[PDB]
């Protein structure tokens, strides 16, 4: 089947201006 | 199979160049596993002929030679299962 | 011969090093390395030429090496003084006379 490929958008977890709690969310 | 990735490419403006030189560009709305491209408001330019705009078209996957997608096609997120 | 001159040179070098350390560290640095002072200008150091007996510490003369297959260590002592790197006046005069004769 030769070679296929795909990449998931690496959405970095929000760190600043979260306006939420202390610990980073899931 | 790459037919499942083309089946999830609905409501996207792309082109398909056939084996006879006819290139039809439009918004693809439906695609089965046999690459039955049903598009709406497309424009097809044949080999050594004038382009013709149609409100609906149904291009077969057997006579389709190649495809052409723009730079706004998320191929990294649509080629996953 | 002027041991007083050697002591004065050592004191002057110590004073200059203390001034440099004060300019760098606000407090008194406990035995700042001579590498900060005596390293040549090309390498980024102060390029100090001193006639003191500043022995290079063999304890902290070992370099590192970030090898691709792990961590590798490296091996390498007195900082030289100009007391001998410059020919003495009598030897310089004798050599100059001989060189003048040879050139003529």
């Amino acid at each position: 089947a030769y070679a296929i490929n795909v990449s998931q958008k690496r959405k970095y977890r929000q760190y600043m201006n979260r306006k939420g709690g202390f610990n980073r969310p899931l | 199979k790459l037919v499942r990735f083309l089946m999830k490419l609905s409501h996207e403006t792309v082109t398909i160049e056939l084996k006879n030189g006819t290139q039809v560009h439009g918004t693809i709305t439906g695609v089965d596993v046999s690459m039955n491209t049903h598009l709406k408001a497309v424009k097809m330019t044949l080999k050594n002929r004038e382009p013709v705009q149609l409100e609906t078209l149904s291009i077969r996957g057997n006579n389709i030679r190649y495809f052409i997608l723009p730079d706004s096609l998320p191929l990294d997120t649509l080629l996953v299962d | 011969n002027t041991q007083e001159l050697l002591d004065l040179l050592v004191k002057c070098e110590n004073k200059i090093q203390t001034r440099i350390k004060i300019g760098l560290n606000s407090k008194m640095p406990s035995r700042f390395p001579p590498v900060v002072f005596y390293t040549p200008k090309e390498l980024g150091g102060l390029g100090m030429l001193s006639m003191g007996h500043v022995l290079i510490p063999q304890s902290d003369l070992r370099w590192s090496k970030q090898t691709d297959v792990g961590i590798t260590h490296f091996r390498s002592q007195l900082i030289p003084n100009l007391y001998r790197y410059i020919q003495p006046w009598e030897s310089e005069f004798i050599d100059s006379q001989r060189v003048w004769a040879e050139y003529a």
Partner: protein, 92 residues
């Protein structure tokens, strides 16, 4: 298991590390590019495909005396099916 040892595995090697390969189809067109995805039916989806082919003026002077040129086009993202594809070869 057998997906990296077949003849298609050769096309897989051509795109093993997004390598550049040129595919010659049945319409005498050579599309060179990095294959992003493949399938069992040789449906190669690639990005930034340079299509080079032979073009002719088709008797521009009126006596059919002309030379073919290398016509070259660029595509952002293409999806060439394995039906019209004839051969493929990776770049050395």
């Amino acid at each position: 298991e057998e997906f990296n040892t077949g003849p298609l595995s050769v096309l897989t090697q051509s795109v093993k590390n997004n390598t550049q390969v040129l595919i010659n189809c049945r319409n005498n067109k050579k599309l060179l590019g990095r294959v992003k995805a493949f399938d069992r039916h040789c449906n190669m989806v690639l990005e930034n495909v340079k299509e080079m082919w032979t073009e002719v003026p088709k008797s521009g002077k009126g006596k059919k005396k002309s030379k073919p040129v290398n016509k070259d086009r660029y595509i952002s993202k293409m999806f060439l099916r394995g039906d019209s594809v004839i051969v493929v070869l990776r770049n050395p």
